[PDB]
Amino acid sequence: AYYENPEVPQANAYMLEAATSAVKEVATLGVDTEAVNGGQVAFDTVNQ
Amino acid sequence: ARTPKKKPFFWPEQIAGFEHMYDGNDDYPYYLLNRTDENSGDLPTQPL
Amino acid sequence: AGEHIPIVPVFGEWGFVEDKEVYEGVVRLTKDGQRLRNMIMSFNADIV
């Protein structure tokens, strides 16, 4: 008989999937053009 | 965060005097439980 | 020396919820998804 640690529940793994998708979601506004003039286009128009 | 997770169940009468054999640290490479008890002895069968 | 207010705040998307002001950069509710990852990171570190 050998000690059985918490193996990290399926609830934690389910939350990791929801977590990774959530943080990148707002972080990228929406890349209009690769490199310069990415997600900052919305900011750039009203800035000028 | 909140939930009990996979850890061994014991009885209060076989965990008596063992609290240095569980602490989350290496003070031990084994565990100890009470094998026999008064009012008819017992033998291991994985009682946990 | 101005003939108008010389202070120009730049905004991203700007408007009102109804009557309270609200505006957003690329960080607004990005904070949510970062905390779910941090949750799992802090809890499982304790298990380890």
From Swiss-Prot, chain A:
Cystine connections: none
Subcellular compartments: Virion
Top-rank taxon, per record: Viruses
Family: Belongs to the p22likevirus portal protein family.
Function: Forms the portal vertex of the capsid. This portal plays critical roles in head assembly, genome packaging, neck/tail attachment, and genome ejection. Procapsid assembly may initiate with a nucleation complex composed of portal and scaffolding proteins. The portal protein multimerizes as a single ring-shaped homododecamer arranged around a central channel. Switches upon genome packaging from an asymmetrical conformation in the procapsid (PC-portal) to a symmetrical ring in the mature capsid (MV-portal). This change of conformation may serve as a signal for headful packaging.
Quaternary structure and interacting proteins, as annotated: Homododecamer. Interacts with the terminase large subunit; this interaction allows the packaging of viral DNA. Interacts (via C-terminus) with the head-to-tail adapter protein gp4; this interaction participates in the head completion. Interacts with the scaffolding protein; this interaction initiates procapsid assembly, thereby ensuring incorporation of only one portal ring per capsid. Interacts with the capsid protein.
Record protein name field: Portal protein
Residues represented out of the complete protein: 390 to 437 of 725
